[model samples]
Target: MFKCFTCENAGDNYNCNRWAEDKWCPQNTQYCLTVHHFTSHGRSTSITKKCASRSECHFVGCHHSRDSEHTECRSCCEGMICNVELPTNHTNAVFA
Candidate 1:
């Protein structure tokens, strides 16, 4: 079992509440999942990266709301620290 970077942040880019909680991935969960979300103004970003399976990845889309446009992308990779570096500028993301 290998440990992976895991955190869940909302409204902002950093300072995730779960940043202090780091653990190893389960056996069935063989990948690191990185999810990025952007707002309408594209000022703020949300991130949720953790242990996941291949089936959980591959969801990329944008949701339009009254005030902001919510865009999200999920990427999965195998190996340790695979989710360490993520793209803040998701303008050219898979959903783009």
Candidate 2:
């Protein structure tokens, strides 16, 4: 099931929010970016899933608002690679 981290709205993961917006869709695994190939005045857009699979969604340094644009607001969980253990020796690590 897909769930939006901001709104907690769950649905099919095939659909995603607009670019530069934040949404937590559990069904989507890979990060997708739509970049228009243009000779001049090229435009690029990126969307980051607030959470994916076993990865956790962190809202640190994020601006909380119902109508605010969420670009570069949220961060994904670390140590999410397969068979990889969480870091144990980082003195500056932030935990949820």
Candidate 3:
């Protein structure tokens, strides 16, 4: 069994981690997932963290949406509370 920081709709990294609950991930999950949602200008709007599977984290990188004018950075790590930090060090932004 493993634990991950789990939260949703948090306004920022601090708040995300602040109220995040440490929970045991299910056996099906193999990673801790973190997604940072921000505006085109790079202002963070929200954050989400939870246990996830390999398929759910296949695209572990930053993705920019032109229609929404926002960016989302995703990351997956394999350890207890490994998704504590924002996924800032992402691959090249993928435009959509």
Candidate 4:
């Protein structure tokens, strides 16, 4: 079995670089999924990191934004400490 960092599901306040804590997922929990997201309704923005299974990492894409002006972007992959950043670092290494 392996362990991954996780938090209250969605819309929870998580301290950055705060995944020091660990939770055991099914050994099949294969990836760390990260997303830089915004909701135009509240104009809210945040980053999310979560444990993902193989299927969860399959065919990821963007939502049809009710507010195309704003919505969400998600990134995902396998392995330890592999994840994405928030709005500021979203376009990291000049890669968006």
Candidate 5:
């Protein structure tokens, strides 16, 4: 399980609003959050996620492909962290 350094709440998934509202550490405290992501390409599957620290956050391509690329935007108390997931044509994959 991935534990949020800023928030005492422990879980594989991190809810930005919950983390911020609970005052895990501080309003603007910097913490690494992990987001699960997946991609596929004709039997080729890519499943991976990353942890980033920032102030503002948003999902760029969490649902559909945009501009032939997968991207996500995140905001923290410090700044914004943009994560891009490269698109690959594959069968299918699921991320949790």
Candidate 6:
């Protein structure tokens, strides 16, 4: 069983991790995923963490939504609690 940080709609990074539940992923779930949602000006609005499958991790990077009102970053990694941090490296804003 693989343990991962799990939370939904957390306020920020600290709250996301601090309030996360220590739960084991299902047999088919192979990755720990993190998503950070922020405004155009870089103000974080929410964070989500969970165990995910390969398809869910397909877009593993920052993406600027079509509306351009906010941005979201998705990151996925293998191992217990591997997705402890948000994907900040690709902050260049790739429109998806």
Q: What are the candidates' C-alpha RMSDs?
A: 7.4, 14.5, 8.1, 6.4, 13.0, 8.1
Better of 1 and 6 by TM-score: 6
Best by lDDT: 3
Q: Which number leads on TM-score?
A: 3
Clashing pairs in 2: none
Off by over 4 Å in 4: 1-3, 8-20, 38-44, 84-96
lDDT (Cα, 0-100) at 81 in candidate 1: 56
User: What is the alpha-carbon RMSD of candidate 5 to the true structure?
Assistant: 13.0
Q: Candidate 6, overall lDDT?
A: 0.76
Q: Each prediction's TM-score against the native?
A: 0.67, 0.19, 0.74, 0.55, 0.23, 0.71
Please write out the lDDT profile of model 2 over residues 1-96, one tens digit for every residue.
323322222222222332223433445443222211112222332323334432233224344344533233443343322111112244344366
Candidates 2 and 5, the one with greater lDDT: 5
**Model 1, 1-96: lDDT tens per residue?**
877767776443345434815577777788887777766576667767788886666563444455557766677766665565665342222332
Q: Which ten residues in a row have the lowest lDDT in candidate 5?
A: 76-85
| Model 2 lowest lDDT segment of ten | 31-40
Off by over 4 Å in 3: 87-96
Cα-based RMSD of candidate 4: 6.4
51 Cα displacement, candidate 6 (Å): 0.4
* Residue pairs in collision within model 6: none
**What shift in Å separates residue 48 of candidate 1 from its native position after superposition?**
1.0
Whole-model Cα lDDT per candidate?
Answer: 0.65, 0.30, 0.78, 0.57, 0.32, 0.76
User: Native-vs-model 5 lDDT?
Assistant: 0.32
Clashing pairs in model 1, backbone N/Cα/C closer than 3 A: none
Least well predicted 10-residue stretch by lDDT in candidate 6: 87-96
